[PDB]
Amino acid sequence: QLLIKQIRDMRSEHVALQNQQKLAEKVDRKISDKDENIQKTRCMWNTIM
Amino acid sequence: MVEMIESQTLLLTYLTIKMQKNLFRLEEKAERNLLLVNDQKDQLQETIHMMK
Lengths: 49, 52
Description:
Chain A is elongated. Chain A has helices spanning 2-25, 34-48. Chain A is mainly alpha-helical. Chain A has 2 helices and no strands. Helices cover 80% and strands 0% of the residues of chain A. Helix content of chain B is 96%, strand content 0%. Chain A binds chain B through residues 3-4, 6-7, 10-11, 13-14, 17-18, 21, and chain B through 34, 37-38, 40-41, 44-45, 47-48, 51-52. Chain A: Residues 1-37 form a coiled coil. Chain A: It comes from Xenopus laevis.
């Protein structure tokens, strides 16, 4: 009985999370430029300071 | 009187051996079923964690 209850609860949780991932991937293609933008910003500050 | 007690002992002993054999078969089937379900639980738990 315990195991039945636990599996049911987890299945419900898995569906909820799948709906949230589908909304987030429509935004991400452009990530290949992060480390480069951070270093660029850091460099600009260092130059000013 | 000694013959009667021996007959009772025979009945009880027979019942006992018969019950024990059938109980061991159930326990083994039960534990197998629990392990199978537990394994399913474990796979779902890992997938949920990765998504989170």
